[PDB]
Structure 1
Amino acid sequence: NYQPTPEDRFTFGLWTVGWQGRDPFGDATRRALDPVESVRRLAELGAHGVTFHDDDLIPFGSSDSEREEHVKRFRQALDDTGMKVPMATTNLFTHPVFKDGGFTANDRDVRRYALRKTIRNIDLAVELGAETYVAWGGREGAESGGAKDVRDALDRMKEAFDLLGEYVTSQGYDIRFAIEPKPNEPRGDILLPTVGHALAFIERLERPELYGVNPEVGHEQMAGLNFPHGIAQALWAGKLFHIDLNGQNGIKYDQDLRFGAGDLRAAFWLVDLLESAGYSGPRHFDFKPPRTEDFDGVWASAAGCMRNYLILKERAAAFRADPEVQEALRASRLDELARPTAADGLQALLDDRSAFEEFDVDAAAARGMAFERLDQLAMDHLLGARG
């Protein structure tokens, strides 16, 4: 039946189901949602948690009484539904003061204002019980070559993340940070565009154990890269703290389709990788219900994300647990890929005559790899057509 359970750890953003449909060529098609109503509806669908921007919960320019009133209503809804908040983030892209950037704006006072806004939201997020803080560098980039000195911008971004790490260490919080890469949209070229650039940036920080990545399926597919390879490098580094799941149709604008739409085979291999590696964080959906839909379509899209994940998880487990698949995996020598190359050592490899002087390159080249048979078994298990 593929019914979601709270052990699946499915979470949704408030900006996802609360999107009003304002695109660059059109007005809003839906009215605004109350966050309390969003929590109650998502708890009815069987979700585990919600995430938020600071401006999603408290409107910009609110007084302290309005701030504490919104926080009190939102914690009341969380206590009534039993829902959790596992991640929060700050909005440094909507207001026109951030048009040049946030942490790497050319104006020093804008950079200081962005740091103070982030610190205030980190205090609220620890108050609500979040475990991961996400920084999205949305306005950090340039449309032209001379507008932004990139080495200086990387120095300012390093300084900002070092200050945030110093603050959480001095306060004694247990929250960690995560960086969300994206290649373009809305700037012409965004700093730290991929998972690899984000990981290489994290290794230069002062306390590199507090920082990880938060990759998104759509953002890695906008650069034509392969999302399971990117996720596997992040897992190899030990830095996958949180993940965003959606869909995307090739290299174009950010579509943010529901999960399973877009590249279905890549979604299958991604669910295979996460269930095999034992990733235990939240399964966060960052999608936009299309502006042709009313509220019933919104809730149908939100249910469809979780249903597609549960179907792909069942099919991937059935593919790995099949004896003919295990025979094909031995025939393609994946078990030999898992073996060490030279554990006997460098001197033994240099003295091994079977490794250069007496190695039959023609006999080694004549062997096929049977990858097409393996892939056809994977396609049959995905489509349900084993027979």
Structure 2
Amino acid sequence: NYQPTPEDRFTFGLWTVGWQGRDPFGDATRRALDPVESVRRLAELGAHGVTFHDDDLIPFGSSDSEREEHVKRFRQALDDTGMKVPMATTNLFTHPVFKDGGFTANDRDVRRYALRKTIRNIDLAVELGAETYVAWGGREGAESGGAKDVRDALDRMKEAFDLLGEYVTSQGYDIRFAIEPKPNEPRGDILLPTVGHALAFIERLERPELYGVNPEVGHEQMAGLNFPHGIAQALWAGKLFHIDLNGQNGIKYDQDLRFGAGDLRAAFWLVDLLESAGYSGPRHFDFKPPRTEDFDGVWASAAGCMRNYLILKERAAAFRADPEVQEALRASRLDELARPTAADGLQALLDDRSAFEEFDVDAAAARGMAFERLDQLAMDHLLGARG
């Protein structure tokens, strides 16, 4: 019955199940969770591991002895359960000091602090076994046009990520970075607002091989973009280092619904792509159990994340295995799309009368794509309504 097990690689942030329910218009509806409790409960649900922001695990402003106690307890829970920590990240957004950014704050002293805060937590992430270190620059941006010279901000952004790369290289760490885009919220506009912008920026870093993306379902959907398509571009670039899975209903505030909620067909096509491409990284959920829920509802929502992935995995696999689908894909020329356009080379293409003077454009135009029949097979598979 779609029961997750550790090899399914499902992970959760401490801040997900641990979200107390404060929003822009409301106070907390749930008590804080002890990270130890979350590790044990997630393990019992069949999770593979957890992730954290520095300040989720160690309260901001902790002394070194307080810090070591929080880390010791957490490590004992990880030890006891075999839960992994594949990813961690820095909170560069909550504290008021980051109101204008971390790495791109106009105040230089804040930018330096942001880097030091990040470096401290890289060391901890590495100790705990993380392979990826995520950066969500939620405060990088502006509400007004004069407040932020974006070229200079990108210079600062590059400087910061280059220093982090120099740091991990100097320590011999194999951890890689994953930049997480978001278009807006909490800033009016956030820098590097989409997968594409982040991918482009990475190509201007000194050591681009150390950086990839951590796309989040809902974030690309906040710009009305097709999440599967963006994932395909990330995979095509070799840069899908990690992913955040959740749900979102279109263009509005960041909802962080459980995975499978929001745009269900997009979730189907995402799972189909990840499985077809052989994505091997964590299936990480960055979600918030709605503040209507009590803790039983927290754990139900978490369990639903994993369940929906597994159901969708089964349906996508059935779709791709169905001989009727395989024939529909041929009818729609998906196989021709995989063939090089002109492996014969430029001069042969220029000399090919079949490609121009003798190309019967009308006959080609008349050939239907058969995409609706293919899509209704896909629908039937998703809904368990075959044959």
The TM-score normalised by the length of structure 1 is 0.99
Q: Once the 2 structures are TM-superposed, how far is the Cα of residue 224 of structure 1 from its aligned partner?
A: 0.4
In angstroms, what is the RMSD of aligned CA positions?
0.7
State the SS of the aligned residue for 2:250.
Answer: coil
Distance 1:300 1:226 in 2: 28
Greater CA drift, 347-356 or 275-284 = 347-356
Q: Once the 2 structures are TM-superposed, how far is the Cα of residue 66 of structure 1 from its aligned partner?
A: 0.6
The TM-score normalised by the length of structure 2 is 0.99
Q: Partner residue of 1:221?
A: 221
Distance 1:346 1:62 in 2: 64
Distance 2:349 2:100 in 1: 56
Distance 2:167 2:261 in 1: 41
Q: 1:80-114 deviations in whole A, cap 9, x for unaligned?
A: 11101000000111111111110011111111111
Q: 1:183-235 deviations in whole A, cap 9, x for unaligned?
A: 00000000000000000000000000000000000000000000011000000
Q: Percent identity?
A: 100
Distance 2:343 2:378 in 1: 33
Q: 1:237-288 deviations in whole A, cap 9, x for unaligned?
A: 0000000000000100001000111111110000000000000000000100
Greater CA drift, 357-366 or 239-248 = 357-366
Q: Once the 2 structures are TM-superposed, how far is the Cα of residue 25 of structure 1 from its aligned partner?
A: 0.7
Q: Partner residue of 1:381?
A: 381
Q: Between Structure 1 and Structure 2, how many residues are aligned?
A: 387
Distance 1:31 1:100 in 2: 29
Structure 2, gaps ≥5 residues long = none
Q: 1:40-67 deviations in whole A, cap 9, x for unaligned?
A: 1111101000000111111111111111
Runs of 4+ more than 2 Å apart = none
Q: Once the 2 structures are TM-superposed, how far is the Cα of residue 347 of structure 1 from its aligned partner?
A: 1.1
State the SS of the aligned residue for 1:85.
Answer: strand
Q: Partner residue of 2:100?
A: 100
Q: Once the 2 structures are TM-superposed, how far is the Cα of residue 357 of structure 1 from its aligned partner?
A: 1.3
Distance 1:40 1:337 in 2: 47
Q: Once the 2 structures are TM-superposed, how far is the Cα of residue 78 of structure 1 from its aligned partner?
A: 0.6
State the SS of the aligned residue for 1:289.
Answer: coil
Structure 1, gaps ≥5 residues long = none
Distance 1:349 1:117 in 2: 56
Q: Once the 2 structures are TM-superposed, how far is the Cα of residue 22 of structure 1 from its aligned partner?
A: 0.6
Q: Once the 2 structures are TM-superposed, how far is the Cα of residue 2 of structure 1 from its aligned partner?
A: 0.7
Q: Partner residue of 1:212?
A: 212
Q: 1:334-371 deviations in whole A, cap 9, x for unaligned?
A: 11111111111111111111111111111111111111
State the SS of the aligned residue for 1:47.
Answer: coil
Q: Once the 2 structures are TM-superposed, how far is the Cα of residue 175 of structure 1 from its aligned partner?
A: 0.5
Q: Partner residue of 1:12?
A: 12
Q: Once the 2 structures are TM-superposed, how far is the Cα of residue 128 of structure 1 from its aligned partner?
A: 1.1
Q: 1:127-175 deviations in whole A, cap 9, x for unaligned?
A: 1111100111010000000011010000001001111100111111110
State the SS of the aligned residue for 2:85.
Answer: coil
Distance 2:354 2:169 in 1: 55
